[PDB]
Amino acid sequence: AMLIKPKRLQPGDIVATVSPSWGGAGDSEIRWRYEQGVKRLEEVFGLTVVPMPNSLKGSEFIYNNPQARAEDLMTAFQDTRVKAIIANIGGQDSIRLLPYIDFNAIRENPKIFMGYADVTISHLFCHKAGLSSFYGPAILTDFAENVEMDPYTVEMVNRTLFSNEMIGEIQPAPEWTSERLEWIEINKDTRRTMQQNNGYELLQGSTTVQGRLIGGCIEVLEFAKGTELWPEKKHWEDSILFFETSEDHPEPSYIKYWLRNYAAQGILQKAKGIIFGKPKDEMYYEEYKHEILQVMKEHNLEDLPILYNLNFGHTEPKFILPYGSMAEIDCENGSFSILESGVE
Amino acid sequence: AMLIKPKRLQPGDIVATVSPSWGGAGDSEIRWRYEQGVKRLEEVFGLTVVPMPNSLKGSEFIYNNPQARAEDLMTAFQDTRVKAIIANIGGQDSIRLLPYIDFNAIRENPKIFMGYADVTISHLFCHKAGLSSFYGPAILTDFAENVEMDPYTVEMVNRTLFSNEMIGEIQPAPEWTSERLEWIEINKDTRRTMQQNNGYELLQGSTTVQGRLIGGCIEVLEFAKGTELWPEKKHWEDSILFFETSEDHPEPSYIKYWLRNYAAQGILQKAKGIIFGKPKDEMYYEEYKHEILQVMKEHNLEDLPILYNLNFGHTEPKFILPYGSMAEIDCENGSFSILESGVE
């Protein structure tokens, strides 16, 4: 392993919230939702939440100030009190933070960093600095789930961040949702409709493979390709890639194009296996499988283990993927496991 | 200059035709269209046209055999009798040729290579080999135009490939088209409806900049990012970038993402100017403008000269852009010029 494993959380610890992308958490009509997420962090996990100075100044300020976003991260990391850093929400332009990041400040201050979607860029900040981060729940989307948090997400947070024991087998969620419910306070007492779940889907493969995890939102990863933010070649060696599609529902052909580029970099030929998150609203659920299998066929990778319909990405509930942690794709059973603890 | 300038073309010369991407040129109901385009090269320019062994074996074969596609490319170069190579048509999967390219075969045999769209990847083959190639007309799209080749396209071919004089100023075409007329022989005497062209639009800038051309199809350029097919850092210094959208009609927001990536690589900061080809069907004509200007605003580049609606790309008629040749954007006169000769 080439990534520092951060120390586990425990009640009483300080957790900093940041807005590395969209600054919507500071907005007047979305603020209620942020405070609700904070409320769950304090009550369900016994944590203390401290927002970094610029993280709530509104989406207008934060957009025009990518520099202000970066120093929030630096402030959060350089603070020895802060034990974990959780992104409020994704967005789309956190790549503008690139020339303002002190990677050394991350390397010297190892701690839990969590988020997904566009926060993937921030995960590449930690990765390059040599720090293992966590692809998982964000404040506005997961910790602020109306009425009550999903027991599945809560369980997975306890196992990955609050326990130093091996995570192990990851079971599919009993139900799932991606239903659109506007973040206006009039809806805080309304539950979201849950669709029943199917379980994991094995597209191809017939052996049990083991590799370290790397990847994220497949759209967002394109933003960093060709840049200095892109991980070294040694990181892709013997790896389990995880991809997931965003809320914008990318056309099946774009999934094909992007996978073709991973083969052009030689990444797909290095992988031990691949896992895919559940598409939002299960849109293009069948079309995506066609394009994935076509690419593997085009590049003679028809024996590379691929798991489908996992509970991570733009669908709730989620589990947590620690970057660099050893994972396992059991084709014989169609199961997925993380063969170590998320935290030291 | 860092790219080798090929020898000029003259009557009697042998021109090779290749299918680096879609191999539909050899299909039984399209072969007529190939022969029509060849007929013009033989009669208008007085050239001898020779098909490469695998280039007319059909779309299905050529799709399943990217190595055979590369073997055609290597054959055309290594044969000292061939003075020019012209792609038949674009596609989407020419990136799959990469594992079969001998770059030493290209740099030991400098000659004219011309094409566009997905043939951008093949231009990067020449680019890495150190050869100046020509972003322009292909066989099936331009030369095989029904009833008659557009004089504008014919003029620019003679001014770029047959003449070792300074190309000079490129004037906008009076009319334009990208109408979908099916390539079946019954439609051969039916002409395509033309649209009116309103000239070049300067989006921003007020200076006179000079730089060497580099770019291509902005969608296809994405295929090569992060790969060893991506041009060295020295090639992006003091450059005039040319981008163009394909027939897929990419979302305006995707144009924003890609330009953000160029800004994250530091490419946009090193640019002397940027030019954009007319999008197909002029779809998202005004939407693209906003996204282009929004990106420049995000990175403090609002003084960077940007020309819009030039006559290259997925629209007929076309002019030709030699990679690496010294170009110029005159914001005062709102014009575009090439201060070099396309051929030696």
How large is the C-alpha radius of gyration of chain B?
A: 19
**Nearest chain A Cα distance for residue B265, angstroms:** 5
The number of distinct structural domains making up chain B is: 2
3-state secondary structure of B185: helix
Method by which this entry was solved: X-ray
Is there a contact between A260 and B223 if contact means CB atoms under 8 Å apart?
Answer: yes
Of B166, B197, B225, which closes a domain? B166
Residue whose entry in the numeric block shows the structure tokens 């394109």 = A222
Q: Which of A150, A166, A182 lies at the terminal end of a domain, its last residue?
A: A166
Structure tokens at B303: 């003084």
CA distances from B157 to A164, A274, B316, B319, B341 (A): 69, 48, 14, 7, 12
Distance CA A60, CA A37 (A): 22
- Give the H or E element holding residue B41: helix B31-43
B321 with B136: CB under 8 angstroms? yes
Tokens 């914001």 found at? B331
Stretch (H or E) spanning B14: strand B14-18
Q: Are residues A135 and A177 in the same domain?
A: no
Residues A95 and A31 in one domain: yes
Are A159 and A171 in a shared domain? no
Instruction: Give the distance between the most distant pair of CA atoms in chain A.
Output: 53
Alpha-helical runs (H) found in A129-269: 151-161, 218-224, 252-264
Strand segments (E) across chain A? 14-18, 48-51, 82-87, 112-115, 134-135, 168-170, 175-176, 195-196, 201-204, 208-217, 239-244, 273-277, 306-310, 321-322, 326-330, 335-338
Give the chain A residue nearest B94 (alpha carbons): A260
Cβ atoms of B85 and B123 closer than 8 Å: no
Cis peptide before B317 (omega within 30 of 0): yes
What DSSP state is assigned to residue B159? I
As a dihedral over the C-alpha atoms of residue B18, residue B51, residue B180, residue B143, rounded to 10 degrees, the angle is: 100
Chain B residues close to A260, C-beta within 8 Å: 93, 95-96, 223
Q: Are A298 and B93 within 8 A, CB to CB?
A: yes
- Check: CB of residue A83 under 8 Å from CB of residue A115: no
> CA–CA separation, A324 vs A127, rounded Å?
9
* Rounded Cα distance, A190 and A63, in Å: 31
Classify B327 as helix, strand or coil.
strand
- Taking a C-beta distance cutoff of 8 angstroms, is the pair A279, A260 a contact? no
Question: Using CB atoms, which residue from A227, A261, A264 is nearest to B265?
Answer: A227
Is some CB atom of chain A closer than 8 A to the CB atom of B227?
A: yes
Q: Kindly give the residue spans of alpha helices, DSSP state H, lying in B91-215.
A: 103-107, 120-129, 151-157
One-character DSSP codes across B52-83? -TTTTS-HHHHHH-HHHHHHHHHHHHH-TTEE
Enumerate the residues of chain A whose CB falls inside 8 A of the CB of residue B92. 257
> Are B181 and B326 part of one and the same domain?
yes
Over A275-291, what HEC string results? EEECCHHHCCCCHHHHH
Instruction: Please name the residues between 311 and 340 in chain B that touch chain A, using a CB distance below 8 Å.
Output: none
Interface residue A229 vs chain B (CB under 8 A)? yes
On whether both B177 and B311 belong to a single domain, the answer is yes
Instruction: Look at strands B208-217 and B201-204 and give their pairing.
Output: unpaired
d(CA A73, CA A55): 10
- Among A104, A49, A38, smallest CA distance to A74 is for A104
Q: Give CA separation, A260 vs A299, B89, B94, in Å.
A: 9, 20, 10
CB pairs under 8 A between A and B: 65
A225 touches chain B (CB under 8 A): yes
Q: Give me A95's structure tokens.
A: 């790549």
Cα(A86)–Cα(A133) distance, integer angstroms:
11
Residues B176 and B145 in one domain: no
Among all chains, which residue has been given the structure tokens 């951008």? B120
Residue with token string 């890639």: A241
Nearest by CB: A264 against B92, B98, B265: B98
CA distance A174 to A193: 13
Q: Which residues of A touch B98 (CB under 8 A)?
A: 264
**Torsions phi, psi of B18, nearest 5?**
-130, 160
Candidates A62, A249, A265, partner chain B, best to mutate (most B CBs within 10 A): A265
Helix axis angle, B252-264 to B285-298, nearest 10°: 30
Task: State whether B152 and B3 are in the same domain.
Answer: yes
Q: How many residues make up chain A in this entry?
A: 344
Which residue in B95, B223, B260 is closest to A223 by CB distance?
B260
Cβ–Cβ gap B223/A92 under 8 Å: no
Alpha-carbon span A132 to A123, nearest angstrom: 8
Count of other CB atoms within 10 angstroms of residue A282: 14
Co-location of B138 and B180 in the same domain: no
- Are residue A115 and residue A237 in the same domain, yes or no? no
Angle at Cα A152 formed by Cα A195 and Cα A141, nearest 5°? 75
Residue B4, burial from CB neighbour count under 10 angstroms (0-12, 13-18, 19+): middle
Q: How far is the C-alpha of A237 from the C-alpha of A270, rounded, in Å?
A: 6
CA pair distance A155, A134, nearest whole angstrom: 15
Read off the CATH number of the domain in which B70 is found: 3.40.50.10740
In contact, B309 and B127? CB cutoff 8 Å:
no
Return residues 86-105 of A near B (CB < 8 Å): 92-93, 95-96, 98
Residues in B closer than 8 angstroms to A248, CB to CB, are 253
Structural domain of residue B55, as residue ranges? 1-166
SS3 at position B140: helix
Which parts of A112-182 fold into alpha helices (H)?
120-128, 151-161
What is each CA distance from B269 to B117, B219, B239, B258, in whole angstroms?
A: 25, 21, 10, 15
Cα A324 from Cα A339, distance rounded (Å): 11
Same domain? A122 vs A183: no
Q: How far does CA A335 lie from the centroid of its chain?
A: 20
Q: Say yes or no: B1 and B42 in one domain.
A: yes
Taking an 8 Å cut-off on Cβ atoms, the answer to whether B298 and A96 are in contact is: yes
The sheet with strand A14-18 has its strands ordered as: A48-51, A14-18, A82-87, A112-115, A134-135, A321-322
Residues 278 to 317 of A: which have CB under 8 A from any B CB? 298-299
Nominal resolution (angstroms): 2.4
Q: Where among B166, B194, B228 does a domain terminate?
A: B166
Indicate yes or no: CB of B260 within 8 angstroms of CB of A224. Answer: no
In terms of domains, do B306 and B293 share one?
A: yes
3-state secondary structure of B116: coil
